RNA sequence: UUUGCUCCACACAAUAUAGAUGGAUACGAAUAAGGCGUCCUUGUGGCGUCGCUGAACCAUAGCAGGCUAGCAACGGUGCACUUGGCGGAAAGGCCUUGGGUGCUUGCUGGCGAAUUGCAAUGUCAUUUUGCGUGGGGAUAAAUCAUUUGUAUACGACUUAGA
RNA sequence: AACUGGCGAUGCGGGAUGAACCGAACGUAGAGUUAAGGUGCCGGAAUACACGCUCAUCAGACACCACAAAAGGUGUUAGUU
RNA sequence: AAUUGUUGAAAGGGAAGGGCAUUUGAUCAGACAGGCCAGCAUCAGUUUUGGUGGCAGGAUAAAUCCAUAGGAAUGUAGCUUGCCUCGGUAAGUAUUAUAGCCUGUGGG
């Protein structure tokens, strides 16, 4: 949807005479700005409680900065998505350095692999994976072997002028 | 008669691999690969160079042939301490790569007169060498 | 899903020296020398010790990694093909007309001249591939034997003969005539 | 000595245009060795000259010049728009043009 | 930037070379392309052979003369790719095309001239490794181009006379490199060292 | 719609345009593949069609109902007095095809060939080749270099020869001149051969022997403007038809809305170049021979 | 038919120009590899080194580059000559010998520059043709008409004619 | 047939092309900024950046729009139990 | 007037003619004696593109950094064991030791 921020959002059915101080419910929402994030908040709240923006009220809307933004983390991600033929539940695993960075690339993968646009996707849970060997998918497990190294063959260097008088070399 | 099988010895993505940034507010600065995120992202940190610890796409950086003993995941202070230890900056500064860089930085900073001064010197150097290229 | 590194081992015997610049392989052992071009295939060879060589694929998909093993195999068969060598035995079969095979030569050629196939008046010829020797086995009836260092040159010179004797316009389950490969193996015995 | 050039070499690319309508009032100039917008903001305001020859002598010369000025940058590749006392003649598309160093500011 | 730009066609992807050659033309830049027969095309040989036959079947029904014209030679194949990217029925288009010459092999003049290469059309830099491609001289030969053997013959000879050229040249730069060494450490030298030279 | 009854087209499309040929002497568009192991001689000869006659012979065809029996067969007779060699021409291979780089000529040129280079012999000063003839005067110098260039280069060697047309009943004087590829060993031998034969003469038997299969290459007799019926062998339209019946009724369908190339129209018939092959030589007569 | 034609030279004139303005600066090949230097056992060799762009390399100071003196070098470069050699893919260009001559900013001197007035491309490229001058060289043909008939609606084709 | 908006009566930018779609409604002009739609070359405008996917011996390529289905695949990709 | 001849000028690769614009050629008005045009400077209106300074919010950013307690493994030192060209490997113990990392709390 853009580059993502993560918000804590809090709202509560409008106070009534006979029921003042209603319950307060929170969601963590991944959106690109605070306006979309409250649109989203209300989107899901109406999928659980009887409320709608018209009869409720946001109480607090707060960015949640990554606690350890240079600590490489193995994330497990849980997602609901509709495909063309129907609607399904997935679990993927993203190895990035901050929840917000990873939710970003999830959305890329869903779009690339399963053609799911943003509207069709429900993040259900994103959480850090504490022990290794709770990592399931192998496209992550690769990157947790000990003393790991790898080269980057066939190096291509972006030419700056239209012509060239050498003849390139993909060496690295 | 032994076997004799080529080589192809690549620079590697690995912890403690020093890496020349090429685009950003760092760009032209060295830095080291702390941990390793995936096939295309890495975690770099170059506290000596002033470049901040970050996750960087490997496309915006170029692997140098320098390496040093660095524990995977090592924080910035640890990085600063191991870097100085291996004496990275001298190791790089003295290399034909980093000298060629400084050499063109200089030719860019030449004043119009200094540029005129280079011409006469080359005139002088050429006179004696074109001579020597005729006596042996 | 792009596997980061996978390699295979190419074991090397005492009587052989393989040499690989770019991906042009040359193996020389007792039986002689074989060379094979691998430029089409994008793998990384790495010596470890005159009895061991490795081939690797970095960041490769299925279709690529799946081509890694078959590079090993190919170089293996070059190695064995030059120590032991290869020997393919085929045995004529016919239901009434004796298939009549010989080795004819027009212009230093060496051919495999099959006559009377299914009683044909036609004279079939298969060319003898350089690197393969054809002996007609003594002590066994209607046998032919192709031997050489190149598996691929023998198995083919083999197969080109069996196919020159395909049976047209008859029920090929009843009319089993032909020449068929009956045993594929090495040249040096015990092994 | 051998060189005397006090200008930067140039090329008359197109008029300013849409897909299907051009505007002869603005030429688009390609300045040799200027490759980004940031590079080409140096040349903004420099005077341009398109020198050309003719058969009729005039003020005692057979050489004539249409004068202009770089006025703004164009796109991302250091192309530059410019206007002239009289629009450039559309045959000049691909001709050489002279971008001078004045009004300087060094 | 230079009066003429000689492009060694070898190793470039047709439409990408055609595309930069086209623009260069229209911007006033004279260009000759050499070694058009060592040009490349993405996709394997058979696809591009078929593709060529599709092109080959179009012609003016009532008179196969007036209809489209199917040139076989790798240069002309290339020219077609190239003319397709120029407003070639305008005067300006004909203007620009005259600034262009395509050649099989490297004939006189341009064999002594240095030829350059176009990184953004270089196949070895462009095509994903593992992709299949096509050589233009092979393609051209399968569709009636006559002269693939004569060109390779003349080229092999030309490469022989050029390997000598290089060899003599590398021998002489060894003197110059040795001369410049004794002049190093001198006063001129460390002064120029200072000024970046 | 669809024909009605299918039937094959009239005429062969690989002979268009059915126009007049550019010259009486049809061109040899091809010469035999060269075998540089044999002696060198000509690969084609020049003659004049004289007439036809009948021949009787025993046929030797084991299996045919006419084995060992007499047949009568028709044969043409070509008048064939020795061609006289007067030049060699060397060709080099180029990526744009075969190019001729030089031609060395004999020093002495018959008025027959010299006539060929003129349109008005009688009035002309006949200075043709006279300055070339000088080139021999000096030692030889320049003729050698050219002859030497030809050996140095040239993938192909051909010989300019011309006919002794005055040894022929014709009224026509102006002789015929033509290149003939030489197919014997070694480039250098071929030019050596031709230089040796300048002004000298060459005979038919040294090209053709008995029972050899040779091809003929001439210009079909001409008939001028020709209707569609005889020219293309089109059906005559019925008798009842208005405005003529040696026509083609339907010139074409409505679309493509043009008459097409593949449709027989009237036009020139004859004076076409033809390369006829596989004509066996039954007799190589010698003139000095009652 | 009014001294015509051609190649070299200069002179004046015209007429051009898809667009000079320091230099188109020559291996080949590979790219999951190579260039260069070096050593050897001359190899699919040992060792070293380089790349990460031509941001190079070469040239570049002097009335658009004037007039002049000297030194140190024996080098460089322009020009016309001459020795030997190479190049046919469109070679029409490349290399080498020897003297003659100009320049040299390698370094050190004498003189000059203004008033083009505070900018006005400020004119220095190369196209073709034309007219006389004189230093070499050369002295035809085709067409109408006539004629053949291997050709032809007419043109055209193919013949013949001191 | 219904409600609105349009074309008809209407040019201008886009959709190559096109009455009705998208954008936007017109006095004569200058400077600027945009819409819809674009920016390899034709063609003004990043052979821009980023993560995936796809190799098709009839690949695919942007609304209206110039068509394709049931059913299959041990091609490859991520998923579910 | 259509249309035609001559002369002069000019253009013409499957029509011609038209719009905006400019080169070139031809042609002509007016104005100078403040007329035509420019250049720079200081301003005014509109606008475009840079450099740089002072501040406000947030978990009074989150981090890094330092201090502290705890912890584990893609286990660093040591130790043990087993081969193994005199140590190097491998598999065991082993949580800071001859690397370090993670987590919480506190400070600026
Ligand atoms: Mg929402
Ligand atoms: Mg809802
Ligand atoms: Mg949903
Ligand atoms: Mg780029
Ligand atoms: Mg190497
Ligand atoms: Mg510089
Ligand atoms: Mg059957
Ligand atoms: Mg049957
Ligand atoms: Mg244009
Ligand atoms: Mg524009
Ligand atoms: Mg104007
Ligand atoms: Mg134009
Ligand atoms: Mg143009
Ligand atoms: Mg131009
Ligand atoms: Mg057509
Ligand atoms: Mg085209
Ligand atoms: Mg043009
Ligand atoms: Mg590539
Ligand atoms: Mg039918
Ligand atoms: Mg019937
Ligand atoms: Mg032919
Ligand atoms: Mg021929
Ligand atoms: Mg019979
Ligand atoms: Mg000649
Ligand atoms: Mg006549
Ligand atoms: Mg007739
Ligand atoms: Mg008749
Ligand atoms: Mg007939
Ligand atoms: Mg009737
Ligand atoms: Mg009929
Ligand atoms: Mg027709
Ligand atoms: Mg022009
Ligand atoms: Mg070369
Ligand atoms: Mg070499
Ligand atoms: Mg090397
Ligand atoms: Mg070497
Ligand atoms: Mg030796
Ligand atoms: Mg060697
Ligand atoms: Mg080596
Ligand atoms: Mg260089
Ligand atoms: Mg001077
Ligand atoms: Mg002086
Ligand atoms: Mg002296
Ligand atoms: Mg001197
Ligand atoms: Mg030639
Ligand atoms: Mg040429
Ligand atoms: Mg020549
Ligand atoms: Mg001199
Ligand atoms: Mg000078
Ligand atoms: Mg001047
Ligand atoms: Mg004269
Ligand atoms: Mg007379
Ligand atoms: Mg509407
Ligand atoms: Mg209405
Ligand atoms: Mg209306
Ligand atoms: Mg409207
Ligand atoms: Mg429009
Ligand atoms: Mg639109
Ligand atoms: Mg459309
Ligand atoms: Mg829209
Ligand atoms: Mg709408
Ligand atoms: Mg086009
Ligand atoms: Mg553009
Ligand atoms: Mg950009
Ligand atoms: Mg298709
Ligand atoms: Mg099909
Ligand atoms: Mg079909
Ligand atoms: Mg296609
Ligand atoms: Mg749709
Ligand atoms: Mg389906
Ligand atoms: Mg599937
Ligand atoms: Mg499911
Ligand atoms: Mg036409
Ligand atoms: Mg006008
Ligand atoms: Mg007055
Ligand atoms: Mg006034
Ligand atoms: Mg003015
Ligand atoms: Mg202002
Ligand atoms: Mg600020
Ligand atoms: Mg603060
Ligand atoms: Mg503690
Ligand atoms: Mg460590």
Swiss-Prot record, chain A:
Q: Which residues carry this modification: Phosphoserine?
A: 32
Q: Name one GO molecular function term.
A: structural constituent of ribosome
Q: By its UniProt entry, which Pfam families does this protein fall under?
A: Ribosomal_L18A
- Supply the SUPFAM superfamilies for this chain: RplX-like (SSF160374)
**Quick one: where is this thing mainly located?**
cytoplasm
Q: Indicate where this protein resides in the cell.
A: Cytoplasm
* One cellular-component annotation, GO: cytosolic large ribosomal subunit
Keywords assigned by UniProt, alphabetized: Cytoplasm, Isopeptide bond, Phosphoprotein, Ribonucleoprotein, Ribosomal protein, Ubl conjugation
The residues joined by the cross-link Glycyl lysine isopeptide (Lys-Gly) (interchain with G-Cter in ubiquitin) are 125, 131, 149
List the GO biological process terms.
Answer: cytoplasmic translation
**Known role:** Component of the ribosome, a large ribonucleoprotein complex responsible for the synthesis of proteins in the cell. The small ribosomal subunit (SSU) binds messenger RNAs (mRNAs) and translates the encoded message by selecting cognate aminoacyl-transfer RNA (tRNA) molecules. The large subunit (LSU) contains the ribosomal catalytic site termed the peptidyl transferase center (PTC), which catalyzes the formation of peptide bonds, thereby polymerizing the amino acids delivered by tRNAs into a polypeptide chain.
Misc: Present with 54300 molecules/cell in log phase SD medium.
Q: Which family does it belong to?
A: Belongs to the eukaryotic ribosomal protein eL20 family.
* UniProt protein name: Large ribosomal subunit protein eL20A
Q: Which gene encodes it?
A: RPL20A
Swiss-Prot record, chain B:
Instruction: Please report the PTM annotation for this entry.
Output: N-terminally acetylated by acetyltransferase NatA.
Q: Does the keyword Glycosyltransferase apply?
A: no
Where located?
Cytoplasm
Using the chain's own numbering, where are the disulfide bonds?
A: none
Q: Give any extra note attached to this record.
A: Present with 45300 molecules/cell in log phase SD medium.
By sequence similarity, the record places it as follows: Belongs to the eukaryotic ribosomal protein eL14 family.
The name on file for this protein is: Large ribosomal subunit protein eL14A
Organism listed in the record: Saccharomyces cerevisiae (strain ATCC 204508 / S288c) (Baker's yeast)
UniProtKB/Swiss-Prot annotation, chain D:
Indicate the secretion signal residues: none
Which InterPro entries does its entry note?
Ribosomal_eL33, Ribosomal_eL33_CS, Ribosomal_eL33_sf, Transl_B-barrel_sf
Cellular location(s): Cytoplasm
- Per its UniProt record, what Gene3D superfamilies does this chain match? translation elongation factor selb, chain A, domain 4
Look up keyword Ribonucleoprotein and say if it applies: yes
Annotated positions of the N-acetylalanine modification: 1
**What keywords sit in the KW lines?**
Acetylation, Cytoplasm, Isopeptide bond, Ribonucleoprotein, Ribosomal protein, Ubl conjugation
Entry PTM? N-terminally acetylated by acetyltransferase NatA.
Entry's Gene Ontology BP terms: cytoplasmic translation; ribosomal large subunit assembly; ribosomal large subunit biogenesis; rRNA processing
Q: Which GO terms describe its molecular function?
A: structural constituent of ribosome
Ribosomal protein among the record's keywords?
Answer: yes
Q: Where is this cross-link: Glycyl lysine isopeptide (Lys-Gly) (interchain with G-Cter in ubiquitin)?
A: 46
Q: Which family does it belong to?
A: Belongs to the eukaryotic ribosomal protein eL33 family.
**Its biological purpose:** Component of the ribosome, a large ribonucleoprotein complex responsible for the synthesis of proteins in the cell. The small ribosomal subunit (SSU) binds messenger RNAs (mRNAs) and translates the encoded message by selecting cognate aminoacyl-transfer RNA (tRNA) molecules. The large subunit (LSU) contains the ribosomal catalytic site termed the peptidyl transferase center (PTC), which catalyzes the formation of peptide bonds, thereby polymerizing the amino acids delivered by tRNAs into a polypeptide chain.
Comment field (misc): There are 2 genes for eL33 in yeast.
Q: What is this protein called?
A: Large ribosomal subunit protein eL33A
The root-end lineage is: Eukaryota, Fungi, Dikarya, Ascomycota, Saccharomycotina
Curated annotation (Swiss-Prot), chain E:
PROSITE patterns recorded for this chain? RIBOSOMAL_L13
One GO-annotated biological process of the protein: negative regulation of translation
Molecular function GO terms recorded: mRNA binding; RNA binding; structural constituent of ribosome
> What keywords does the record list, in alphabetical order?
Acetylation, Cytoplasm, Isopeptide bond, Ribonucleoprotein, Ribosomal protein, Ubl conjugation
Q: What InterPro entries does the record point to?
A: Ribosomal_uL13, Ribosomal_uL13_CS, Ribosomal_uL13_euk/arc, Ribosomal_uL13_sf
Source domain of life: Eukaryota
Q: Which Pfam families match?
A: Ribosomal_L13 (PF00572)
> Where does the protein end up?
Cytoplasm
Which part of the chain holds the cross-link Glycyl lysine isopeptide (Lys-Gly) (interchain with G-Cter in ubiquitin)?
A: 175
Its biological purpose is as follows:
Component of the ribosome, a large ribonucleoprotein complex responsible for the synthesis of proteins in the cell. The small ribosomal subunit (SSU) binds messenger RNAs (mRNAs) and translates the encoded message by selecting cognate aminoacyl-transfer RNA (tRNA) molecules. The large subunit (LSU) contains the ribosomal catalytic site termed the peptidyl transferase center (PTC), which catalyzes the formation of peptide bonds, thereby polymerizing the amino acids delivered by tRNAs into a polypeptide chain.
Q: Which family does it belong to?
A: Belongs to the universal ribosomal protein uL13 family.
Instruction: Please give the HAMAP family that the UniProt record associates with this protein.
Output: Ribosomal_uL13 (MF_01366)
Q: What is this protein called?
A: Large ribosomal subunit protein uL13A
What is the native source organism of this protein? Saccharomyces cerevisiae (strain ATCC 204508 / S288c)
């Amino acid at each position: 949807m853009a580059h993502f921020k993560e918000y804590q959002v809090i709202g509560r059915r409008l106070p009534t005479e006979s029921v003042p101080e209603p319950k307060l419910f929170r969601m963590r929402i991944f959106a690109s700005n605070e306006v979309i994030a409250k649109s989203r908040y209300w989107y899901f709240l109406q999928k659980l409680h009887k409320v709608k923006k018209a009869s409720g009220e946001i109480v607090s809307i707060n960015q949640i900065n990554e606690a350890h933004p240079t600590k490489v983390k193995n994330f497990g991600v849980w997602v609901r998505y509709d495909s063309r033929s129907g609607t399904h539940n997935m679990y993927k695993e993203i190895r990035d350095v901050s929840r917000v960075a990873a939710v970003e690339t999830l959305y890329q993968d869903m779009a690339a692999r399963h053609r799911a646009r943003f509207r069709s996707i429900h993040i259900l849970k994103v959480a850090e994976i504490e022990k290794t060997a709770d990592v399931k998918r192998q496209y992550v497990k690769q990157f947790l072997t000990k003393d790991l190294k790898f080269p980057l063959p066939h190096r291509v260097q972006k030419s700056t002028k239209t012509f060239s008088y050498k003849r390139p070399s993909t060496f690295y | 008669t032994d076997s004799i099988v080529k080589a192809s010895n690549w620079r590697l993505v690995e912890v403690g691999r020093v890496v020349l940034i090429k685009k950003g507010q760092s760009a032209g600065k060295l830095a080291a690969i702390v941990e390793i995120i995936d096939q295309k992202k890495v975690l770099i940190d170059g506290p000596k160079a002033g470049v901040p610890r970050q996750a960087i796409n490997l496309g915006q950086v170029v692997l140098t042939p320098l390496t040093f003993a660095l524990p995977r995941g090592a924080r910035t202070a640890t990085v600063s301490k191991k870097w100085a230890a291996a004496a990275v900056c001298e190791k790089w500064a003295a290399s034909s790569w980093a000298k060629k860089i400084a050499q063109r930085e200089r030719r860019a900073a030449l004043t119009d007169f200094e540029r005129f001064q280079v011409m006469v010197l080359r005139k002088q150097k050429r006179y004696t060498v074109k001579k020597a290229l005729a006596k042996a | 899903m792009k596997y980061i590194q996978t390699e295979q081992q190419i074991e090397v015997p005492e009587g052989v020296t393989v040499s690989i610049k770019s991906r042009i392989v040359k193996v020389v052992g007792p039986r002689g020398t074989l060379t094979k071009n691998l430029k089409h295939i994008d793998v990384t060879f790495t010596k470890v010790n005159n009895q061991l060589i490795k081939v690797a694929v970095h960041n490769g998909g299925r279709k690529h990694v799946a081509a890694l093993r078959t590079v090993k195999s190919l170089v293996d068969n070059m190695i064995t093909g030059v120590t032991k060598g290869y020997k393919y035995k085929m045995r004529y079969v016919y239901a009434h007309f004796p298939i009549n095979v010989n080795i004819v030569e027009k212009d230093g050629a060496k051919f495999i001249e099959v006559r009377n196939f299914l009683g044909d008046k036609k004279i079939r010829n298969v060319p003898v591939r350089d690197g393969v020797t054809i002996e007609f086995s003594t002590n066994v009836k209607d046998e032919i034997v192709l031997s050489g260092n190149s598996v691929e040159d023998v198995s083919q010179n083999a197969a080109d003969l069996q196919q020159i004797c395909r049976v047209r316009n008859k029920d090929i389950r009843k009319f089993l005539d032909g020449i068929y490969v009956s045993h594929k193996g090495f040249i040096t015995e015990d092994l | 000595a051998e060189s005397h050039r006090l200008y930067v070499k140039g090329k008359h690319l197109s008029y300013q245009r849409s897909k299907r309508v051009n505007n002869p009032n603005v030429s688009l100039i390609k300045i040799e060795g200027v490759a980004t917008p940031q590079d080409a903001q140096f040349y903004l305001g420099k005077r341009i000259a398109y020198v050309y020859r003719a058969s009729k002598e005039v003020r005692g010369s057979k050489i004539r010049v249409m004068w202009g000025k770089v006025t703004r940058t164009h796109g991302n590749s250091g192309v530059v728009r410019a206007t002239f006392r009289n629009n450039l003649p559309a045959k000049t598309f691909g001709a050489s043009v002279r971008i001078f160093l004045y009004p300087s500011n060094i | 930037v230079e009066p003429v730009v000689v492009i060694d066609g070898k190793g470039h992807l047709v439409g990408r070379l055609a595309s930069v050659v086209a623009k260069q033309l229209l911007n006033g830049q004279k260009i000759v392309v050499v070694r058009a027969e060592e040009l490349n095309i993405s996709g394997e040989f058979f696809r591009n052979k078929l593709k060529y036959h599709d092109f080959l079947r179009k012609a003016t029904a009532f008179n196969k003369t007036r209809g489209p014209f199917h040139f076989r030679a790798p240069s002309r194949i290339f020219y077609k790719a190239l003319r397709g990217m120029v407003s070639h029925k305008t005067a300006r288009g004909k203007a620009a095309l005259e600034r262009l010459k395509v050649f099989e092999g490297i004939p006189p003049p341009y064999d002594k001239k240095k030829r350059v290469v176009v990184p953004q059309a270089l196949r070895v830099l462009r095509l994903k490794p593992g992709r299949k491609y096509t050589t233009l001289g092979k393609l051209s030969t399968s569709v009636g181009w006559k002269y693939e053997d004569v060109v390779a013959k003349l080229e092999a000879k030309r490469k022989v006379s050029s390997a000598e050229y290089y060899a003599k040249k590398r021998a002489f730069t060894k003197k110059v490199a040795s001369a410049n060494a004794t002049a190093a450490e001198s006063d001129v030298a460390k002064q120029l060292a200072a000024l970046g030279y | 719609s669809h024909r009605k009854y299918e039937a094959p087209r009239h005429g062969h499309l690989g002979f268009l345009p059915r126009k007049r040929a550019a010259s009486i002497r049809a061109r040899v568009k091809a010469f035999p593949k060269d075998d540089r192991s044999k002696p060198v001689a000509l690969t084609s000869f020049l003659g004049y069609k004289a007439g036809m006659t009948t021949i009787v012979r025993d046929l030797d065809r084991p299996g045919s109902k006419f084995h060992k029996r007499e047949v009568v067969e028709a044969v043409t007779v070509v008048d064939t007095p020795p061609v006289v060699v007067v030049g060699v021409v060397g060709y080099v291979e180029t990526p744009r095809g075969l190019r001729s780089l030089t031609t060395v000529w004999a020093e002495h040129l018959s008025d027959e060939v010299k006539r060929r280079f003129y349109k008005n012999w009688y009035k002309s000063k006949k200075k043709a080749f006279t300055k070339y003839s000088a080139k021999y005067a000096q030692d030889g110098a320049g003729i050698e270099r050219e002859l030497a260039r030809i050996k140095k280069y040239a993938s192909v060697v051909r010989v300019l020869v011309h006919t002794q047309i005055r040894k022929t009943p014709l009224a026509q004087k102006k002789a015929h001149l033509a290149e003939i590829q030489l197919n014997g060993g070694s480039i250098s031998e071929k030019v050596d051969w031709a230089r040796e034969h300048f002004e000298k003469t060459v005979a038919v038997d040294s090209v053709f022997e008995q029972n050899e299969m040779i091809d003929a290459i001439a210009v079909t007799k001409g008939h001028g403007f020709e209707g569609v019926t005889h020219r293309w062998g089109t059906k005559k339209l019925p008798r009842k038809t208005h405005r003529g019946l040696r026509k083609v009724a339907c010139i074409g369908a409505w679309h493509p809305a043009h008459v097409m190339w593949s449709v027989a129209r009237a036009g020139q018939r004859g004076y076409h170049s033809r390369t006829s092959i596989n004509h066996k030589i039954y007799r190589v007569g010698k003139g000095d021979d009652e």
